[PDB]
Design an enzyme around this catalytic site. Sequence first.
Site: not given
Lengths: 290, 289
Positions: A127, A22, A19-20
């Site tokens: 993960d 960086i 998600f997101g």
Amino acid sequence: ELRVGNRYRLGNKIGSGSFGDIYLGTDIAAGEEVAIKLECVKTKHPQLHIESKIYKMMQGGVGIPTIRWCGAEGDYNVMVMELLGPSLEDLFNFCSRKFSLKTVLLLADQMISRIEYIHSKNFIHRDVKPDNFLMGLGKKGNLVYIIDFGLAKKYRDARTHQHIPYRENKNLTGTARYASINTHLGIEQSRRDDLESLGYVLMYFNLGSLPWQGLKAAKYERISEKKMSTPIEVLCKGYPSEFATYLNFCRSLRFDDKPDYSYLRQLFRNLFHRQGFSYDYVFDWNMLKF
Amino acid sequence: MELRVGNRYRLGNKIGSGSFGDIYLGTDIAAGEEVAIKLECVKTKHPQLHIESKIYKMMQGGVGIPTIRWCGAEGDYNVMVMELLGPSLEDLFNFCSRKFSLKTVLLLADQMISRIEYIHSKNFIHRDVKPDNFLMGLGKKGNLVYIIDFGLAKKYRDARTHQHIPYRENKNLTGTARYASINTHLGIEQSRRDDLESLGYVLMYFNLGSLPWQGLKKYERISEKKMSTPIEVLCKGYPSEFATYLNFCRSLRFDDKPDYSYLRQLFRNLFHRQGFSYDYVFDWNMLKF
Ligand SMILES: O=C(Nc1nc2cc3c(cc2[nH]1)OC(F)(F)O3)c1csc(NC(=O)c2ccccc2OC(F)(F)F)n1
Ligand SMILES: O=C(Nc1nc2cc3c(cc2[nH]1)OC(F)(F)O3)c1csc(NC(=O)c2ccccc2OC(F)(F)F)n1
Ligand SMILES: CCCCCCCCO[C@H]1O[C@H](CO)[C@@H](O)[C@@H](O)[C@H]1O
Ligand SMILES: CCCCCCCCO[C@H]1O[C@H](CO)[C@@H](O)[C@@H](O)[C@H]1O
Ligand SMILES: [Cl-]
Ligand SMILES: [Cl-]
Ligand code: NA
Ligand code: NA
Ligand code: NA
Ligand code: NA
């Protein structure tokens, strides 16, 4: 010019996790650079702030990333992290998709310890893959960090250590390529499953590519079937037995078992010193200016 | 197993492939510093490492030209060991999410006009001007734009007499089609003007993000889109100096000496009316070389 938190300058995208996204930025006050996770607040299912708390629970663990500052700001929850060197996938490609036995064992030894440390603060990662392992910068340059606790969860109660219940019909969670056999079958993920994924990461680093990689459909059933059909002895052929032994151990674990993390490392360090390597942290990518 | 090419240079991982051969990071054991090491196979069908090395040897001591360190054969290979340079403008554009500010495109334009002029002053055309072939320098020289890859380069005049190569038609494409000149497409011999035109498209790409004639679904369509798209469409929404720049290059005759200074000053003037300081701060300043 883009400011966040009234102390960070936002630069360009340097990453995309589960998600997101960086980005690079600078602690304007401190005069030193940083990683800045941003998640936009109009996502169906918010996550940065949960992940943020997973990071505060791991803090001051070997090769766990330091969290500098967290908070929501307009349209983006934001999370400023210590900046980190590159990922093992990045390095793997820089080294042309092949690592020496020495580099794969220096990494195996650290990878198992970070996984063990996560498991002791009551979480499974879920993960484990090359991108979520990162080398630090400068002083902490021969040190693999772990990142992306965006799919991680509690596998046992913080107080009683009661294991989560066994169940079935779970969706895929984690990257198809490195999933456990059990995850492909819909079984709830546990510690065994994190270490079995490390197993595939280690063989991937040896083979250049796993044999269920790069099939071509128009679902991912196919991946599952060839991972489950590949005899371990054939995946690991032409590589030390220790790689078959690690994966057979993990494939042989039970749902709630505490894996024997000292034993699995031991496979590798004994193989290490039998080959005549020196534990000097000279990796394959060693001629870089980290 | 360790490997010292020559006696002095430790070979390492591949970091590049140009027009021909490949480039690997290597270390100058003795001097403790790092280098880049080109390799070509001795038994290759169309040998050009010896040739490229002569062009660099003669272009040495030009601003923004990489230093020749060492040349020889080893095993099945020819080797040319060079100065280590930092990343390409293509690499950096991508890091900047395919967006370069006007200050950076102008700061870049100045240096790129000079490099090409230098090359032309040494009697060669590059023929593959494009953002992969412009690299920034390392450490001390991170302000400097360098130019690489003369595997497609050609002598356009005599060093002695400055006699010009002759006009020729029906040439096959040499160099990238995305940035080629209109006349390169028509199969006219390439000259100084064409390097400068190619650069104009690089500059406008830096502005746009992508050129109009890219992404298309047999390259003939790249060509025919370039000749539908007049400069004043391409360059709309941007300062007119870019259009001026392109029109000028498209007007040069085959053996014309371009007025590099004029084309440099179009940009310098606009630089100082925007109010920018010529301080060498690029959009990618966050990075640390
Ligand atoms: O991703 C990088 N730093 C980073 N990422 C983070 C992600 C984070 C984080 C801190 C982080 N720090 O905390 C967090 F949890 F929020 O998530 C980084 C630094 S250098 C680099 N890569 C390359 O130099 C690179 C790249 C591509 C190809 C070859 C490349 O060259 C290579 F890597 F092979 F040397 N990536
Ligand atoms: O190509 C590189 N050095 C190089 N090339 C040469 C080619 C040469 C030569 C010397 C050379 N030195 O002499 C020669 F004439 F023989 O030809 C190089 C250095 S760093 C780099 N790339 C990246 O930092 C990069 C990578 C991926 C994404 C973003 C990247 O850049 C980012 F994102 F960091 F800004 N490439
Ligand atoms: C000395 C500077 C280190 C930067 C190395 C960057 C390597 C990435 O770029 C190259 O490497 C690829 C494999 O990783 C190859 O495909 C090369 O052609 C080039 O893309
Ligand atoms: C802060 C250290 C600089 C490292 C930059 C590495 C750039 C390559 O990887 C990223 O860059 C892409 C384009 O620059 C982005 O789109 C990201 O997705 C990431 O892959
Ligand atoms: Cl069980
Ligand atoms: Cl141990
Ligand atoms: Na992440
Ligand atoms: Na080991
Ligand atoms: Na080259
Ligand atoms: Na200028």
